[PDB]
Design a protein around this ligand. Sequence first.
Ligand SMILES: CC(=O)Nc1ccc(O)cc1
Ligand SMILES: CC(=O)Nc1ccc(O)cc1
Lengths: 106, 106
Amino acid sequence: NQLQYLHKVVMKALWKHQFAWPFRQPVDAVKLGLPDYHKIIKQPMDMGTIKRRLENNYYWAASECMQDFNTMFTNCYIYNKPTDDIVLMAQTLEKIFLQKVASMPQ
Amino acid sequence: NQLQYLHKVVMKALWKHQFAWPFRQPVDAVKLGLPDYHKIIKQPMDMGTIKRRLENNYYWAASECMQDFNTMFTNCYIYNKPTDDIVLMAQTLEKIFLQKVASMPQ
Ligand SMILES: CC(=O)Nc1ccc(O)cc1
Ligand SMILES: CC(=O)Nc1ccc(O)cc1
């Protein structure tokens, strides 16, 4: 029920959120012109990957899925400048993620 | 039971962790020589404040306490350089926080 909740409640709300768009696919450092991205970011993560993983029964515990969300947001905070819009977008999304996690079943 | 779990399980493990020390008290931008800290960081947070809040029944829901932890970690990622040791310290602590949150009661 935990993973089903993360898929059907948490990911459903985040995926369609207006600020989701920069996070729905992996960062393409070449297309985005970010030559140092993978020098700085050790473990890339995005909602597209998390969504596919939920759909495919990839996770064993809710904790792993939660860690993936955390990694995605943290990468954003670490790589980007504090004043970048994407940082505010991540913050908004992460607050919702945490709120929903707080109501997750045991 | 949620808030009691965050206090007696989550905060107990984080407080005494070896990487806790930079997070046990508010960032003193004057003493640490960080003149731009409060220009960049809008909502300061630390484990000392969270611990006092848990002790004093400040929180209404686990979500608020969780948000405070998140804010503390996010501030760290946003303000500091990616290669700073404190960033790795925050990451380690946040992973533990999330792991414990995953086993929190409803
Ligand atoms: C998730 C993330 O950091 N995305 C991202 C970063 C910089 C940029 O210029 C475009 C997109
Ligand atoms: C929580 C935090 O960012 N602390 C912190 C940042 C920079 C520094 O030089 C010393 C401490």
